Amino acid sequence: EPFGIALTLFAVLGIFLTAFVLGVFIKFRNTPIVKATNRELSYLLLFSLLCCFSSSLFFIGEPQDWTCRLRQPAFGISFVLCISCILVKTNRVLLVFEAKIPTSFHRKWWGLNLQFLLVFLCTFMQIVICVIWLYTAPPSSYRNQELEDE
């Protein structure tokens, strides 16, 4: 049906637009305004948005056990990943701009460890909930013919 052909022909346009955007941030990766926003966490967000557009393509076609099991957790994890990225980026700048006396980070590299581990800490709670759920009662397909006769 064209409705299916449609949702698919949107979810390719979104993928292409996200790919185009990541290309600028890769070509113009040293301009003052690009570096103004976190050029690490800005990249990770773009990948999460790519994951988001893709989750939708698991609702098209005849449902199966693995598809029905993977339908919701993928989108939930991707969206919470994006939200965590936004939240951690915002707090860093407020902290940078709420500075009285100078910094004291002891190692430059571990310095950017906090930037990445906070996102994983935020996502840990839903990765937990997804795992326990799937093992203690996985979703499954179900052919229903009771509601309408024909």
């Binding site: 003052p32 103004a36 940078v96 701009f97 500075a99 009285k100 006396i101 100078p102 910094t103």
Partner: protein, 219 residues
């Protein structure tokens, strides 16, 4: 049980003092002679040969300004002590263009420029901002009709031999700096110009924000 108790108490007190000393700052008032150091200090101290430090009590930070001009000895041998200082409050007087010195028949502007170049050129002072206070503006503004600088200075081919413009001396001091120089904060003051302490806090906040923004790599 003497040794353990004494050591533990001393370590605890020292750690408490170190933690309490987290909020502090140091600045040096390196200025030339006859720059009105006492006059400038008195105005800010009223409200808002030994090395004497003035413990300012600004908001949430105890500022410390140290007087170092009155030494009369070698400077490189003890300049190593000040390395954590975040700014230099260098001071000049604008009336030395015609106030010739003969005690060497060279104008004190040349000596002030040489001192500024020596202080800025120091490789040690690389992560510290520069504050260039200009005092005694009234004399330069008033007495210029009899003190044209076309002969006393070689780079003032302006309108004619009145209408004082301090921007020429500003440019002369600014040009004496290497390329990619940090922002030089210079606000002209007077005998009773009250708006100076707040110019200082402005440069301090800016000197720090720029640095941390460099450290967290946000650029």
């Amino acid at each position: 049980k003497a040794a353990v108790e004494r050591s533990k108490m001393i370590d605890r007190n020292l750690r408490r003092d170190k933690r309490d000393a987290r909020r502090e700052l140091k600045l040096l008032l390196l200025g030339t002679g006859e720059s009105g150091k006492s006059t400038f200090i008195k105005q800010m101290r009223i409200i808002h040969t030994g090395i004497i430090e003035y413990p300012f009590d600004l908001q949430s930070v105890i500022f410390r300004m140290v007087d170092v001009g009155g030494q009369r000895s070698e400077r490189r041998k003890w300049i190593h002590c000040f390395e954590n200082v975040t700014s230099i409050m260098f001071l000049v007087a604008l009336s030395e263009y015609d106030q010739v010195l003969v005690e060497d028949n060279e104008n004190r502007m040349e000596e002030s420029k040489a001192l500024f170049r020596t202080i800025i050129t120091y490789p040690w002072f690389q992560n510290s901002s520069v504050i260039l206070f200009l005092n005694k503006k009234d004399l330069l503004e008033e007495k210029i009709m009899y003190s044209h600088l076309v002969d006393y200075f070689p780079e003032y081919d302006g309108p004619q031999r009145a209408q004082a413009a301090r921007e020429f001396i500003l440019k002369m001091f600014v040009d004496l700096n290497p390329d990619s120089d940090k922002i030089i904060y210079s606000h002209f003051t007077c005998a009773t110009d009250t708006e100076n302490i707040r110019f200082v806090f402005a440069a301090v906040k800016d000197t720090i924000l720029q640095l941390n923004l460099k450290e967290y790599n946000l650029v």
